[PDB]
Amino acid sequence: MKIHVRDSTLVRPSAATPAVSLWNSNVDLVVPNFHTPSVYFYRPSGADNFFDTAVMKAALGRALVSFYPMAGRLKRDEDGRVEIDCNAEGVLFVEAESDGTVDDYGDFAPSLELRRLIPAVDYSQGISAYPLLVLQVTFFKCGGVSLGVGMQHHAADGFSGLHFINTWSDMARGLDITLPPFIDRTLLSARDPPQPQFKHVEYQPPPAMKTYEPAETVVSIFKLTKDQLTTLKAKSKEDGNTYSSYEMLSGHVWRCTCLARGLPEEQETKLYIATDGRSRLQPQLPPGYFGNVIFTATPLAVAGDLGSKPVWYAASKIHDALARMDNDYLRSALDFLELQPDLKALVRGAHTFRCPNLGITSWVRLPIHDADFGWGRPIFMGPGGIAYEGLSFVLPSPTNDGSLSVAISLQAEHMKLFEKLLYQI
Numbered sequence: 001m002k003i004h005v006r007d008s009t010l011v012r013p014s015a016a017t018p019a020v021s022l023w024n025s026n027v028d029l030v031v032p033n034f035h036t037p038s039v040y041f042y043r044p045s046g047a048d049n050f051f052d053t054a055v056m057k058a059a060l061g062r063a064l065v066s067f068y069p070m071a072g073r074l075k076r077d078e079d080g081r082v083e084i085d086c087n088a089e090g091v092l093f094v095e096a097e098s099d100g101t102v103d104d105y106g107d108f109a110p111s112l113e114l115r116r117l118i119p120a121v122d123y124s125q126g127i128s129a130y131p132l133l134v135l136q137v138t139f140f141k142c143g144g145v146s147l148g149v150g151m152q153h154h155a156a157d158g159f160s161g162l163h164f165i166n167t168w169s170d171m172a173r174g175l176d177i178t179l180p181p182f183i184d185r186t187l188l189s190a191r192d193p194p195q196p197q198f199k200h201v202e203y204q205p206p207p208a209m210k211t212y213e214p215a216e217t218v219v220s221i222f223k224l225t226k227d228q229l230t231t232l233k234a235k236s237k238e239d240g241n242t243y244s245s246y247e248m249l250s251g252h253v254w255r256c257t258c259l260a261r262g263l264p265e266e267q268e269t270k271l272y273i274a275t276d277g278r279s280r281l282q283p284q285l286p287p288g289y290f291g292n293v294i295f296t297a298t299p300l301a302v303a304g305d306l307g308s309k310p311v312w313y314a315a316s317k318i319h320d321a322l323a324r325m326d327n328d329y330l331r332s333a334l335d336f337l338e339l340q341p342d343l344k345a346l347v348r349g350a351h352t353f354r355c356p357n358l359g360i361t362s363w364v365r366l367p368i369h370d371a372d373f374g375w376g377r378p379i380f381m382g383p384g385g386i387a388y389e390g391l392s393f394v395l396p397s398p399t400n401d402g403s404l405s406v407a408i409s410l411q412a413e414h415m416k417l418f419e420k421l422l423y424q425i
């Protein structure tokens with residue numbers, strides 16, 4: 001498939017916005033340096049103006065008025081701390097055409113082929129050289145359209161990013177803003193002086209694999225029916241042992257991964273779980289809080305135990321890790337991060353999620369399919385390509401059947417067994 005760009009432009013806020021330097025909290029600093037990829041897919045609705053770029057950009061400019069930090073640029077203060085220069089330079093909007101079809105992506109497994117649907121960024125010209133948000137509307141050879149999104153997570157996390165996209169689509173349909181964004185990250189300032197309370201196991205080195213081959217990593221996606229999810233939930237009754245569907249599913253995935261990887265009985269495994277601090281921070285963050293509030297629960301386990309014990313054993317560990325992440329624990333994290341000499345060094349990479357470990361996040365809660373720009377909701381949305389092994393995304397169904405999908409990156413030889421184990425319910 002070849003893709004070629006008809007036009008690219010910088011879309012600025014439709015009206016005047018504050019000219020300020022937006023301070024970043026420690027959560028807003030422990031982020032990747034690249035743009036986080038995500039992709040929306042749409043089927044033709046039969047409309048003559050399907051995804052009219054003028055309509056899209058008009059609404060984009062209107063949304064960037066309240067979401068003005070999105071149209072800003074990265075800068076560093078006198079101490080070298082990354083902050084957001086809200087200068088309204090604008091976000092990048094790319095219109096592109098494809099000689100292929102939406103069907104070419106099949107089940108929309110998040111392979112690196114999705115990256116082509118998202119504008120590339122030159123990271124060699126300073127952190128101030130590129131927009132915080134890059135957008136690509138691609139028209140396929142079937143009438144279908146993809147919306148590719150690259151968002152610098154110095155701006156905000158995926159939760160606020162989703163808040164922006166849905167607001168954009170709302171305005172594209174003529175709607176006014178439902179939830180106005182709150183823009184002040186000083187609410188997540190560390191205490192003075194910083195008083196950490198736990199050692200924070202989340203930032204400790206993960207279990208290793210004695211060795212380490214090269215690894216041919218593949219990406220797949222598997223649908224689980226509502227009945228399959230219901231059957232998995234009542235497995236909490238096993239061995240005379242209630243955990244939620246999410247806790248049980250994440251435990252199920254964690255367990256299946258260990259068995260698929262053929263982990264030794266004694267091998268330790270560490271699970272990384274993205275959790276939203278918005279729910280537990282005190283006092284409650286204002287609705288529409290614009291920034292990063294995503295933390296990580298990291299339960300430890302023995303591969304032999306996960307396999308020989310019921311799923312609720314895995315779920316219990318997951319539940320315990322999440323339960324101890326109250327306000328005090330998160331407040332301690334801000335203080336612990338504050339004392340760290342290098343925050344970027346704490347950002348997790350391929351090494352973190354290599355065998356025997358795993359990272360998981362669940363997007364079912366998000367209104368990820370509420371991005372209706374006037375021509376219908378997305379037929380799919382997911383991460384814009386997964387680069388390395390050991391990442392899993394739990395995606396809800398676009399339909400109302402209550403099914404979900406587990407997208408995941410594993411070694412090629414491990415992926416085949418994982419599919420078998422995932423459906424052993």
Ligand SMILES: CC(=O)c1cccc(O)c1
Pocket residue numbers: 272273274296348358359360361391392393
């Ligand atoms: C994005 C994602 O899937 C993930 C999973 C675990 C940890 C983490 O920081 C991120």
